[PDB]
Design a protein around this ligand. Structure first.
Ligand SMILES: Nc1ncnc2c1ncn2[C@H]1C[C@H](O)[C@@H](COP(=O)(O)NP(=O)(O)OP(=O)(O)O)O1
Ligand SMILES: [Mg+2]
Length: 577
DNA sequence: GCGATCACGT
DNA sequence: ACGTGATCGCA
């Protein structure tokens, strides 16, 4: 029983309400709002969008911070309303973020999955209403209106039990002071978008398509035959059958053609180096040139990513359409793709600030390892210092290969450390990789104590927590399968580190957003990628940002070691180095 | 649509 | 390890 309203009435504008602003298109940027539902003390309402959104009283209510709304995934609605020039304020409860904080492993992606966490099943999953894939379609108004009102009624009913459990978990402030404020900041970042120099991308695409046409022909000559180089199946026939190259590794369904395997194969035939060259070129051309060009809005030449705030098990943000968190940086030929990301206005510049080794600094603090804390208090090169201890040599005796192996141990130490992964990344034996680990724990006994203690805490409590009380349940920590249990143990060690770094970055974003407004700067956040914050700002604001941004980031939280921030700026994302 | 494979950045 | 994405090849 609900009201299919033809007009906005005063009772729909109570100062507390569950609100549903339904955007069915997966990418909500400039997307239709197919319907609105309001549940409050006075009843349940369905409002047609081309009525409420043209009603001054409803729009005023949407934008009044004092009128509190409970929603699911408020950022989706916030952004769709931004594209209509409408401001959404007063969202005091986001059931999506609440369910994500209560248990990220649930993969709660719609109201029904979250309600099922609390034995509430009077709401259908979105996929049952809209179908999936080709069959996906908005249903007739009666069916649509019933779904939206059931979702709003579930949100209405679910706020208290979710807030109660968040409070029992000591996560009430995590939701209200971190994730929900961050949702608004992310909505502004997505809406602003990042300007793309498409002519430069097009220029790069033409060039890659040229080098590809060359390497391709060369491969057809070394193979004495034509074939689809991009088919791992076909390529395996040319390599491990026609050319008789050794089979060093075998995927689950045949021969592996990983760059890992091919590297070891290069000595046997000149084709291998070209196939490797062809694959990097092909990866750039198809994923980063053509892929980026597909998602650039032709009206504004901006990409408007979507930050997924309730996806990872660590609390890190994820990004889609495009995923800007893997634009090439390692290789120079692929690093130049960042030259296409420019300021959205003339005489503006890109400013980029990144935490320096925040994960290892977080580890130092959490493990209270004297050796690790002292290394950062002296602002040492951590990889070089790690090599000095592991190999018991002075700084002058550290060779480039020793530092490379110390760096791999550090990369592993923060991601669990397994032996097979270290041995794999270092192309060494497990016993040798095991020897590296034990030398490391000899040098960093507090890290070893932390790794043992956090595993035991994961087993006793059933979860691990981050600095700001994000938790991750680890049910497989007791499993009797060595592999399933090993992964759970490594997530026990890694999650407090990665998740705490994620907490710090999110808090810095909130602190930076407040400071920029305090200082009345025009600078604005565009992207959070990994441990970096990217802003654009007028060139006249660069000197102030050079002091402001690192200070806010370095003060986001107080650890037992300093937080270091490297920052650069330039006319492009590339040049902000 | 869907599994398998590959690869990119943390 | 976190993921996003693209290509291919079979239903
Ligand atoms: N554990 C982690 N988890 C997620 N992202 C990480 C990370 N560690 C680094 N990133 C990012 C953060 C860093 O800003 C970025 C680059 O640092 P690196 O090359 O990975 N290792 P470093 O800088 O300490 O030693 P060198 O002097 O040889 O460069 O990788
Ligand atoms: Mg670093």
């Amino acid at each position: 029983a609900f009201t299919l309203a033809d007009r906005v009435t005063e009772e729909m504008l109570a100062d507390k309400a569950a609100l549903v602003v339904e955007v069915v298109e997966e990418n909500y940027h400039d997307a239709p709002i197919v319907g609105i539902a309001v549940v409050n003390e006075h009843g349940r309402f369905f409002l047609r969008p081309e009525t409420a959104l043209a009603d001054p009283q409803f729009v005023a209510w949407l934008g009044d911070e004092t009128k509190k709304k409970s929603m699911f995934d408020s950022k989706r609605a916030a952004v769709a309303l931004k594209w209509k020039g409408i401001e959404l304020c007063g969202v005091s409860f986001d059931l999506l973020l609440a369910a994500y904080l209560l248990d990220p492993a649930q993969g709660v992606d719609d109201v029904a999955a979250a309600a099922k966490m609390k034995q509430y099943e009077a709401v259908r999953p979105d996929e049952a209403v809209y179908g999936k894939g080709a069959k996906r379609a908005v249903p007739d108004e009666p069916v649509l209106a019933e779904h939206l009102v059931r979702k709003a009624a579930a949100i209405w009913a679910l706020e208290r039990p979710f807030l109660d459990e968040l409070r029992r978990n000591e996560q009430d402030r995590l939701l209200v002071e971190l994730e929900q404020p961050l949702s608004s900041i992310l909505a502004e970042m997505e809406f602003a978008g990042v300007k793309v120099d498409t002519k430069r991308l097009e220029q790069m695409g033409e060039e890659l398509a040229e080098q590809l046409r060359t390497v391709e022909q060369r491969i057809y000559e070394l193979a004495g035959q034509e074939f689809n180089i991009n088919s791992p199946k076909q390529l395996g026939v040319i390599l491990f059958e026609k050319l008789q190259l050794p089979v060093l590794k075998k995927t689950k369904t045949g021969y592996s053609t990983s760059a890992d395997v091919l590297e070891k194969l290069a000595p046997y035939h000149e084709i291998v180096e070209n196939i490797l060259h062809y694959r990097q070129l092909g990866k750039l051309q198809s994923t980063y040139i053509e892929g980026l060009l597909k998602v650039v809005r032709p009206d504004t030449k901006k990409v408007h990513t979507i930050f997924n705030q309730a996806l990872t098990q660590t609390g890190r943000l994820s990004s889609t359409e495009p995923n800007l968190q893997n634009i090439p940086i390692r290789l120079e030929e692929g690093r130049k793709i960042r030259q296409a990301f420019v300021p959205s206005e003339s005489d503006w510049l890109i400013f980029a600030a990144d935490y320096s080794q925040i994960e290892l600094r977080v580890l130092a603090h959490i493990a209270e390892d004297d050796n690790l804390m002292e290394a950062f208090r002296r602002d040492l090169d951590i990889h070089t210092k790690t090599a000095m201890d592991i190999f018991q040599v002075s700084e002058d005796e550290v060779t480039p290969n020793m530092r490379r192996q110390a760096k791999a141990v550090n990369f592993g130490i923060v991601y669990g450390i397994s032996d097979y992964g270290l041995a794999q990344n270092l192309n060494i034996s497990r016993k040798e990789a095991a020897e590296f680990i034990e030398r490391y724990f000899e040098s960093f006994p507090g890290v070893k104590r932390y790794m043992e203690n956090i595993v035991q805490e994961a087993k006793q409590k059933g979860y691990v927590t981050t600095l700001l009380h994000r938790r991750r349940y680890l049910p497989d920590i007791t499993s009797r399968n060595f592999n399933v249990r090993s992964f759970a143990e490594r997530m026990a060690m890694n999650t407090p580190i990665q998740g705490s770094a994620a907490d710090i970055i999110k808090k810095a974003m909130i602190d930076l957003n407040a400071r920029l407004k305090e200082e009345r700067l025009q600078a604005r956040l565009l992207l959070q990628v990994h441990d970096e914050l990217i802003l654009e700002a007028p060139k006249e604001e660069m000197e102030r940002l050079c002091r402001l941004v690192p200070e806010v980031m370095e003060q986001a939280v107080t650890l037992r070691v300093p937080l270091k921030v490297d920052y650069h700026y330039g006319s492009t994302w590339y040049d902000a180095k």
